[PDB]
Amino acid sequence: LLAEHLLKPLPADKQIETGPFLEAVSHLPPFFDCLGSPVFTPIKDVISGNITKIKAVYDTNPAKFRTLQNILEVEKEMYGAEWPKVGATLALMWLKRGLRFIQVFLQSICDGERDENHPNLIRVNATKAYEMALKKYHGWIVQKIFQAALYAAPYKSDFLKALSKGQNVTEEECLEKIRLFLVNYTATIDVIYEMYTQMNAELNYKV
Amino acid sequence: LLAEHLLKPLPADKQIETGPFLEAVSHLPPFFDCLGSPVFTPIKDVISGNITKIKAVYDTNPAKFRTLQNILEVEKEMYGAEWPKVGATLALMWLKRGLRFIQVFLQSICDGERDENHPNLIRVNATKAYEMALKKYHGWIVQKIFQAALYAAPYKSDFLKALSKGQNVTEEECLEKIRLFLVNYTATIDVIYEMYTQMNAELNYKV
Ligand SMILES: CCCCCCCC/C=C\CCCCCCCCCCCCCC(=O)N[C@@H](CO[C@@H]1O[C@H](CO)[C@H](O)[C@H](OS(=O)(=O)O)[C@H]1O)[C@H](O)/C=C/CCCCCCCCCCCCC
Ligand SMILES: CCCCCCCC/C=C\CCCCCCCCCCCCCC(=O)N[C@@H](CO[C@@H]1O[C@H](CO)[C@H](O)[C@H](OS(=O)(=O)O)[C@H]1O)[C@H](O)/C=C/CCCCCCCCCCCCC
């Protein structure tokens, strides 16, 4: 149930408190265990791992790492020339990309983007999310692994069904709750991308 | 370095002490982080997860769960009709299959099985291991994911190189240490398979 854990709104100064953020996004990886296939469990674990790494660094000193901007600027100072490919900065660099993937996927579904010829699939939505969020950073083996995983994707009706877990709500109602979640989720992700740009903390290497 | 953590020999009564076993096989999953690609990290984590689950159950009562046979017979009693698809029995059911995969792969390399036309690849060895250990239990998406991952497989020379980490030893020496490790490793795995048969604890479902 996405809109039961809305993200906070951005404050005027656009600084994101680390503790609240981590707590919010930590409700996202489990969803990957209700998409119908064990092919997604490794994906839960990849995104959780990013979250766990940021929390581990935050837990060393919450006041020093109070906001996400604090994390980047502090680690830049701590690590010198190995930064930004170290620590929580690297974990959040990759986290923002998974989060962005989810954002683009959910927004595509809610904007009614679909394959007219195969309308209860979610493949076009996942393929667009992947091209926007992830593909730039994956070598061809991983891109092939994505293309294989796409076939385990559930039908759209089943996917919406699992997002409400059985609430007996119309798809229309379901999509409206998703639109609501997307408000502060997109705004937050955009601010994390903008901070990576302003700090020159973004790297373009492929895996 | 495989032969620095040899498995114990089997005792006369062919009972495998749980603590020692777990400690031994826990040196195996890290190796997946030195094969040259992030495609294997999810694999480290899948096998570690099986090991972690068995240890978690063992830690509740070491004396009740002293041997692997103890685990199966105790859980059969604890869980009734959900057994063998529960608890440490299910974790070890899947563990033995990963361990068997590694065994068949290493033994194939050491027996000189190779593609004459592509002699410094390890693909035929991985494909045989997969067919012997795993394929029976994978649906076609996962089989496709395996076929994609096969392309991240290192060259044989690099793989042997990483097993000695840089020891300046001939491949011949390397393979002889692997043959030595394989003695008590194969014997132990075979006893775990035989216990699954004798207990009727083996399930054939696909993922
Ligand atoms: C709430 C709604 C849910 C929305 C989702 C519904 C979608 C359903 C639709 C379609 C299904 C199709 C598949 C969808 C795929 C979903 C993708 C979600 C986003 C995933 C994000 C992946 C990010 C990524 O590429 N990561 C990559 C980079 O990770 C980072 O690497 C860094 C070093 O360069 C660091 O190590 C870093 O670690 S840390 O310590 O700094 O934290 C670490 O996190 C990571 O390598 C890729 C992971 C994906 C797995 C690819 C490999 C799979 C191998 C499979 C092998 C199996 C073969 C075995 C056969 C028996
Ligand atoms: C020391 C020497 C090292 C030797 C290895 C060198 C090999 C190098 C050669 C070639 C490389 C080619 C790939 C090689 C593959 C190696 C395979 C190693 C053995 C792996 C064993 C897999 C076992 C397996 O199939 N497991 C399956 C069943 O697991 C069990 O499921 C149970 C329920 O039915 C339980 O949940 C159970 O959990 S527990 O709680 O009870 O413990 C759990 O462990 C498991 O589903 C399969 C895992 C493999 C990953 C497949 C999915 C990958 C998805 C990738 C998605 C990425 C897409 C994202 C794109 C951005």
Curated annotation (Swiss-Prot), chains A, B:
Taxonomic source organism: Homo sapiens
Binding site for beta-D-galactosyl-(1->4)-beta-D-glucosyl-(1<->1)-N-[(9Z)-octadecenoyl]-sphing-4-enine: V46, I47, S48, G49, N50, I51, T52, K53, H138, Y205
Keyword Transmembrane found: no
Region entry 2 X 12 AA approximate tandem repeats, spans: 43-64
Biological classification of the source: Eukaryota, Metazoa, Chordata, Craniata, Vertebrata
Quaternary data: Monomer.
GO biological process, one term: response to immobilization stress
Sequence repeats: 43-53, 54-64
Protein name as catalogued: Glycolipid transfer protein
Listed PANTHER family: GLYCOLIPID TRANSFER PROTEIN (PTHR10219:SF97), GLYCOLIPID TRANSFER PROTEIN-RELATED (PTHR10219)
Effect of Y205L: No loss of activity; 90-97% residual activity
Record annotation: effect of changing W94F: Partial inactivation; 63% residual activity
